[PDB]
Design an enzyme around this catalytic site. Structure first.
Site, PDB file in Angstrom:
ATOM      1  N   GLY A 190      55.844  -0.071   8.816  1.00 48.67           N
ATOM      2  CA  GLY A 190      56.755  -1.783  10.137  1.00 48.67           C
ATOM      3  C   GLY A 190      57.925  -2.677  10.141  1.00 48.67           C
ATOM      4  O   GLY A 190      58.649  -1.601  10.409  1.00 48.67           O
ATOM      5  N   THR A 191      57.728  -2.689   9.085  1.00 51.09           N
ATOM      6  CA  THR A 191      60.017  -3.635   8.167  1.00 51.09           C
ATOM      7  C   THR A 191      60.536  -2.839   7.805  1.00 51.09           C
ATOM      8  O   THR A 191      61.408  -2.843   7.921  1.00 51.09           O
ATOM      9  CB  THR A 191      59.166  -4.660   8.130  1.00 51.09           C
ATOM     10  N   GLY A 192      59.708  -1.993   7.119  1.00 50.15           N
ATOM     11  CA  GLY A 192      60.801  -0.861   6.258  1.00 50.15           C
ATOM     12  C   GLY A 192      61.150   0.192   7.785  1.00 50.15           C
ATOM     13  O   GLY A 192      62.355   0.380   7.185  1.00 50.15           O
ATOM     14  N   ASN A 204      54.582   5.877  -7.146  1.00 50.44           N
ATOM     15  CA  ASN A 204      55.447   5.123  -7.543  1.00 50.44           C
ATOM     16  C   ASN A 204      56.027   5.773  -9.460  1.00 50.44           C
ATOM     17  O   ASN A 204      57.254   5.585  -8.628  1.00 50.44           O
ATOM     18  CB  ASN A 204      55.174   3.842  -7.497  1.00 50.44           C
ATOM     19  N   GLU A 249      82.750   8.308  -6.239  1.00 47.59           N
ATOM     20  CA  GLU A 249      82.191   9.407  -6.997  1.00 47.59           C
ATOM     21  C   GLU A 249      81.074  10.627  -7.219  1.00 47.59           C
ATOM     22  O   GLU A 249      80.978  11.651  -7.514  1.00 47.59           O
ATOM     23  CB  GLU A 249      83.149   9.223  -7.787  1.00 47.59           C
ATOM     24  N   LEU A 269      79.953   4.870  -7.514  1.00 47.36           N
ATOM     25  CA  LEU A 269      79.094   5.129  -6.419  1.00 47.36           C
ATOM     26  C   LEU A 269      80.074   5.551  -6.069  1.00 47.36           C
ATOM     27  O   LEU A 269      80.454   7.261  -6.889  1.00 47.36           O
ATOM     28  CB  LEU A 269      79.185   3.569  -5.792  1.00 47.36           C
ATOM     29  N   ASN A 314      56.682  11.854   0.547  1.00 44.55           N
ATOM     30  CA  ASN A 314      54.811  11.136  -0.189  1.00 44.55           C
ATOM     31  C   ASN A 314      54.051  12.981  -0.324  1.00 44.55           C
ATOM     32  O   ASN A 314      53.531  12.678  -1.525  1.00 44.55           O
ATOM     33  CB  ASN A 314      54.620  10.354   0.978  1.00 44.55           C
TER      34      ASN A 314
END
Ligand SMILES: Nc1nc2c(ncn2[C@@H]2O[C@H](COP(=O)(O)OP(=O)(O)OP(=O)(O)O)[C@@H](O)[C@H]2O)c(=O)[nH]1
Ligand SMILES: Nc1ncnc2c1ncn2[C@@H]1O[C@H](COP(=O)(O)OP(=O)(O)NP(=O)(O)O)[C@@H](O)[C@H]1O
Ligand SMILES: COc1cc2c(c(OC)c1OC)-c1ccc(OC)c(=O)cc1[C@@H](NC(=O)CS)CC2
Ligand SMILES: Nc1nc2c(ncn2[C@@H]2O[C@H](COP(=O)(O)OP(=O)(O)O)[C@@H](O)[C@H]2O)c(=O)[nH]1
Ligand SMILES: [Mg+2]
Ligand SMILES: [Mg+2]
Lengths: 421, 301, 419
Positions: free
Chosen positions: A133-135, A217, A243, A241, A195
């Site tokens: 949904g919101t993902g 997880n 590099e 970040l 997954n």
């Protein structure tokens, strides 16, 4: 310098819930509050506490509510946990338009409330589901707007590619294609996590007949830890970040590097040469596919624990002698090796044991596009009959946006294949 | 079933914004889309795609030329006692209304008018004189599953369907016309009170009657843009239209296809589909969508 | 997030009454009193089906509607009669009907507002309203006619939220009226337009299950309701219980109905009457065990949703569930990918150590619509008992308009046994 984590929607939330816990264990922060370097991810608040630089958002409480319940309850601020009453419904169209619009302004503003106590922020690490949904929906919208409020600042997404068995939803493929389209011109580099691959590793290795989310997880937690790590400890591997990415993505087309975790072995010492050897093994990937097929256009090795380069070298030498090197035409033979002396700590009641040394290997192969196909086919085949499209047109989407998005996935799959020799 | 495509030229706004024209029609049946693309490494190239239609019209084709090869060949069908339909399909601003109703405005320059003009010419021909037919016209629009009489001040009408399944639109006003000037007056009137811009389906009809019975009927349809969740009704109607037309050369119903049902069920029925295309590079994805829909329609011929 | 439950017309009222007392004992609720039972779960999502009032008390979020007292006072002086909120009952007093017209126009309209105004109270009381679910019969009229009305008026005030119904489609055997086909067709049309999901409980199927496979001679309305009542608990489980799915009921819709035309589900139950797992699936996928008179064979499945129950290993379920759509892999439309999802919950139903239930959007349902449209056009031919409606104000062509809409629904389902 600094570094904000954003977790949107169930999968996003729960994944982060588990790697913010591995973080604490790594840096030794007793849930309650207290114990730079460690500062990249935490803001030394109050004259005691240590608190994360994160924001959690979901369009229903449920998930977030368990966070303000189980220990770690104290760990965050009440504000960094945003929740939304009405569900995402399982369709991008809702998360990106209808139901999102209502909560975007409140999230957007709070993450800026976090970035305000950060002398020279760096970028955001965003965790979200691919289908879902919101993902898919909200994420896409967040990123559009984050790009408006934060020009330069990089965006690193940690996406969860869906797989039949660890239950999806019929409409999943639509959602995935949909978000990955809008979201693509706005991310700098993204880490896909299949997954099926994780369900798979928990079977061949941990030996669990029925792998839980809480089981998956935990493992993902570790992969993520090893990814960030470098920029949390600090003076080691992939610093600031930029590099980090300048190392993996050669083309603006957001390239999704393929991640492979070292030794996964259940509780209840592996050679430096051996774990490297296990890194060039399909059965241990993070996205089900195989690069003995495609090509490599940038390899990365991220070690952790007791390791001297002297071996890392001789392990590489022999890792090329009787193997499928297959590097691509116009690109060196990468191998930006990074060692992070700090040992791999694992959760206490966890299913994996303490390990003397672990590797990470982030490679940008052309074979990762084998996953962009597996998804297109599902989508293409359903769209062949407007299968569920009407639910999206219902919230206010155009049938055209469905074409226009698959249209990009047709293009991407072309680019990927085009990089070959 | 006849399927055609018509490219409109770039307009002032597009030329001013320096829009690139990515459409070519090298022959009377071939349309080329010069699709702009980037390789993974950002290299620019063209994927030039080819589509073939019964008739492909370029930007220099006038409405009279388009009319001659699309709706004109269907007029005779109604005099032979059949049911004909002509649809203008494509993206918002592609030229649908301009083609069917007149340039913009000017009714006389559109297909509704031109078709009417030939209907009066044919009825006065010896082969048809002895038919003693009367010409009637109707103009209505479909908006959100609702029918509105454009010749009776947007009056909302009811649509019923017995068990035998024929549909009837209760209250639709039929106007007697005896001259092309008559028809032009009803077209101006109707277009003046239509809900320019799509949002509805426009349908102007020309009916032939003799004695209590309907001899033949020609339904000219100005469809809504194919590219506020009413797009669901528009997409369902377009999906429904496609299957009805394909069922002609051999659902999930909607208002449009319900009202025009009797024009697809008979054996003496013909249809023509005209796909409108906006030539601009910025509309390339909308164009491909229009063309592929068109391909599947003609696919049944 | 939270749902209200409308329950109208003799059949509906009786059907739902058993539903209520069946889930109430699942959750451990007294005729009035609250909890009692060593279980702990239950209460998480008790929210969803129970607005809770003064002191302990639980009182279901239920509205009771009818056009004649009797049936209501049957509940009050019955099973869990004390459980429902007093001014939540809406009496009719006047003539019932057993004729659609009366309930959707004349004697119907009369009440509507007084009910609508009570659903309005329950709804606006809800912290975050999910939607409504209604139980009623398609034959007869005090619920097939007022019901289809009630819903036509819920959408309009609630386009927003979703419409769910359990509707008993009637048959030639075990029926009180010659007119049922008229009443049925007249509603089917209405359902098609204003509901998101509708479960079909065919009484023909129902009778068949009791006598054709259960040695039960004279099937009361009783042991018959016991079937529907058990099925209904199975179908809702996932929204009233665990923490596996959660079930937005909208998620359920968006995922089960590929095509707008609200597609009707045929339900099926595992063990029955008033269990190895491979033994449970083999049964739950058998025609001889569907709740609607059909036979998934003469038609493909669009999407299927199955929900197990009781302490059993999913390792086996996921295995058997794959083994069905293999030994039968031709009957699962291949243009919709992972189109069969299974949910397991570990709180056993009444008696039963093991149990399963099944929800199926199958083109075979076409068979059911065809057979009611068979006795309809078979009577409306030479305009039968029709003058009973003409008289209450209806028009002749409102029948053809219904018939026509209905046959399309058949001509659409039959269109999707494609490729
Ligand atoms: N790896 C992993 N995947 C998850 C987890 N939770 C859900 N998923 C997967 O995420 C996808 C569904 O995304 P959701 O998180 O449920 O969607 P959402 O809209 O973000 O969350 P909701 O509002 O609750 O619907 C599917 O691919 C699931 O398999 C998790 O905790 N870990
Ligand atoms: N062949 C053509 N030559 C010149 N101008 C044209 C032509 N086709 C269309 N136009 C113009 O371009 C616009 C599109 O007109 P119409 O109004 O014809 O669009 P649609 O009807 O294509 N649009 P919409 O109602 O939004 O779905 C109008 O301003 C027309 O006058
Ligand atoms: C009422 O509660 C239910 C609610 C839902 C589902 C369902 O059927 C198993 C229910 O039981 C009847 C559901 C349904 C359908 C699907 O496709 C057929 C799906 O993929 C998925 C689902 C359910 N979700 C999942 O399985 C998520 S892993 C959620 C929606
Ligand atoms: N299984 C179930 N079906 C019933 C019951 N009562 C009636 N029916 C069926 O439903 C149809 C109409 O029901 P009824 O309640 O009399 O209509 P009402 O006037 O709308 O309440 C009948 O034709 C029967 O087939 C019931 O008790 N349970
Ligand atoms: Mg969701
Ligand atoms: Mg127009």
């Amino acid at each position: 310098r600094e570094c904000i984590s954003i977790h949107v929607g169930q999968a996003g939330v729960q994944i982060g819930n588990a790697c913010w816990e591995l973080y604490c264990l790594e840096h030794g922060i007793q849930p309650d509050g207290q114990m730079d370097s460690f500062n990249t991810f935490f803001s030394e608040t109050g004259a005691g506490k240590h608190v994360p630089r994160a924001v959690f958002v979901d369009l229903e409480p449920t998930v977030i509510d368990e966070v303000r319940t189980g220990t770690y309850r104290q760990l965050f601020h009440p504000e960094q946990l945003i929740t939304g009453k009405e569900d995402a419904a399982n369709n991008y169209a809702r998360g990106h338009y209808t139901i999102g619009k209502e909560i975007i302004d409140l999230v957007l503003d709070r993450i800026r409330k976090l970035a305000d106590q950060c002398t020279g922020l760096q970028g955001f690490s965003v965790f979200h589901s691919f289908g879902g949904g919101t993902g898919s929906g909200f994420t896409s919208l967040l990123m559009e707007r984050l790009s408006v409020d934060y020009g330069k600042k990089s965006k690193l997404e940690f996406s969860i590619y869906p797989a039949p068995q660890v239950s999806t939803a019929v409409v999943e493929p639509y959602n995935s294609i949909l978000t990955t389209h809008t979201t693509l011109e706005h991310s700098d580099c993204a880490f896909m996590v299949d997954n099926e691959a994780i369900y798979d590793i928990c079977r061949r290795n941990l030996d669990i007949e029925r792998p839980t989310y809480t089981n998956l997880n935990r493992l993902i937690g570790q992969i993520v830890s090893s990814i960030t790590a470098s920029l949390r400890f600090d003076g080691a591997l992939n610093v600031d970040l930029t590099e980090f990415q300048t190392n993996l993505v050669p083309y603006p087309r957001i390239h999704f590097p393929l991640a492979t975790y070292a030794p996964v072995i259940s509780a209840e010492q592996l050679s430096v040469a051996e774990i490297t050897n296990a890194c060039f093994e399909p059965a241990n990937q993070m996205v089900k596919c195989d690069p003995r097929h495609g090509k490599y256009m940038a390899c990365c090795l991220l070690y952790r624990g007791d390791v001297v380069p002297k071996d890392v070298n001789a392990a590489i030498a022999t890792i090329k002698t009787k193997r499928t090197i297959q590097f691509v035409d116009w690109c060196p033979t990468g191998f930006k090796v990074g060692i992070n002396y700090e040992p791999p700590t694992v959760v206490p009641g966890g299913d994996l044991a303490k390990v003397q040394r672990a590797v990470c290997m982030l490679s940008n192969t052309t074979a990762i596009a084998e996953a962009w196909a597996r998804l297109d086919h599902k989508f293409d085949l359903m769209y062949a009959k407007r299968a569920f499209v009407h639910w999206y047109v219902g919230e206010g989407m155009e049938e055209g946006e469905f074409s226009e998005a698959r249209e990009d996935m047709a293009a991407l799959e072309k680019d990927y294949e085009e990089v070959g020799v | 079933i006849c399927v055609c495509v018509r490219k409109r030229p770039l307009n002032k706004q597009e030329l001013a914004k320096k829009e690139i024209d990515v459409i070519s029609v090298p022959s009377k049946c071939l349309l080329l889309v010069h699709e702009p693309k980037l390789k993974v490494d950002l290299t620019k190239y063209l994927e030039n795609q080819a589509f073939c239609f019964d008739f492909a019209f370029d930007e220099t084709a006038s409405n009279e030329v388009v009319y001659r090869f699309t709706a004109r060949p269907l007029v005779q069908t109604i005099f032979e006692g059949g049911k004909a339909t002509c649809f203008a399909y494509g993206q918002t601003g592609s030229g649908k209304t301009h083609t069917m109703g007149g340039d913009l405005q000017n009714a006389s320059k559109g297909i509704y008018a031109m078709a009417s003009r030939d209907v009066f010419l044919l009825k006065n021909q010896p082969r048809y004189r002895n038919l003693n037919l009367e010409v009637y016209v109707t103009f209505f629009e479909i908006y959100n599953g609702k029918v509105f009489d454009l010749l009776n001040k947007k009056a909302k009408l009811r649509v019923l369907e017995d068990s035998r399944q024929q549909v009837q639109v209760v209250g639709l006003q039929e106007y007697l016309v005896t001259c092309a000037d008559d028809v032009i007056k009803m077209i101006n009137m109707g277009s003046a009170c239509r809900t320019n811009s799509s949002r509805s389906h426009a349908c102007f009809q020309i009916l032939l009657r003799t004695k209590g019975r309907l001899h033949g009927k020609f339904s000219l349809v100005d469809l809504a843009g194919n590219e506020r969740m009413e797009g669901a009704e528009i997409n369902k109607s377009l999906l429904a239209l496609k299957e009805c037309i394909r069922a002609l050369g051999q659902f999930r119903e909607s208002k449009l296809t319900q009202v025009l049902r009797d024009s697809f069920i008979g054996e003496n029925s013909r249809t023509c589909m005209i796909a409108m295309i906006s030539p601009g590079i910025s509309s390339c994805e909308y164009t491909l969508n229009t063309l592929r829909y068109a391909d599947r329609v003609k696919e049944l011929s | 997030r939270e749902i209200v439950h409308i329950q109208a017309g003799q059949c509906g009222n009786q059907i739902g009454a058993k539903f209520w007392e069946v889930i109430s004992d699942e959750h451990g609720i007294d005729p009035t009193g609250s909890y009692h039972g060593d279980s702990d779960l239950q209460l998480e999502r008790i929210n969803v089906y129970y607005n809770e009032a003064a002191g302990n008390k639980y009182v279901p979020r239920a509205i009771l509607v009818d056009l004649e007292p009797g049936t209501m006072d049957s509940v009050r002086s019955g099973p869990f009669g004390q459980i429902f909120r007093p001014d939540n009952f809406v009496f009719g007093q006047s003539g019932a009907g057993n004729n659609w017209a009366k309930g959707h126009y004349t004697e119907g309209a009369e009440l509507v507002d007084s009910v609508l105004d009570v659903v309005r109270k329950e709804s606006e009381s809800c912290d975050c309203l999910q939607g409504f679910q209604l139980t009623h019969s398609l034959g007869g009229g005090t619920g097939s006619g007022m019901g289809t009305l009630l819903i036509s008026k819920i959408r309009e005030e609630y386009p927003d939220r979703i419409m769910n119904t359990f509707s008993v489609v009637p048959s030639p055997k075990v029926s009180d009226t010659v007119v049922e086909p008229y009443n049925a067709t007249l509603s089917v049309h209405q359902l098609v337009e204003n509901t998101d999901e509708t479960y079909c409980i065919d009484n023909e199927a129902l009778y068949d299950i009791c006598f054709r496979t259960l040695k039960l001679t004279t099937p009361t309305y009783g042991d018959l309701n016991h079937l529907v009542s058990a099925t209904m608990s199975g179908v809702t489980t996932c929204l009233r219980f665990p923490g596996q799915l959660n079930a937005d009921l909208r998620k359920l819709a968006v995922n089960m109905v590929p095509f707008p035309r609200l597609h009707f589900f045929m339900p099926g139950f595992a063990p029955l009457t008033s269990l190895t797992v491979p033994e449970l699936t083999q049964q739950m996928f058998d025609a001889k065990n569907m709740m609607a008179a059909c036979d998934p064979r003469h038609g493909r499945y669009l999407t299927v949703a199955a929900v197990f129950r009781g302490r059993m290993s999913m390792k086996e379920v996921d295995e058997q569930m794959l083994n069905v759509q293999n030994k039968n892999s031709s009957y699962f439309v291949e243009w919709i990918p992972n189109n069969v999802k299974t949910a397991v919950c570990d709180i056993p139903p009444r008696g039963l150590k093991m149990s399963a239930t099944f929800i199926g959007n199958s083109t075979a349902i076409q068979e059911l619509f065809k057979r009611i449209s068979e006795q309809f056009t078979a009577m409306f031919r030479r305009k039968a008992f029709l003058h009973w409606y003409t008289g209450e104000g209806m028009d002749e062509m409102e029948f053809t308009e219904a018939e026509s809409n209905m046959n399309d629904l058949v001509s659409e389902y039959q269109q999707y046994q494609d490729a």
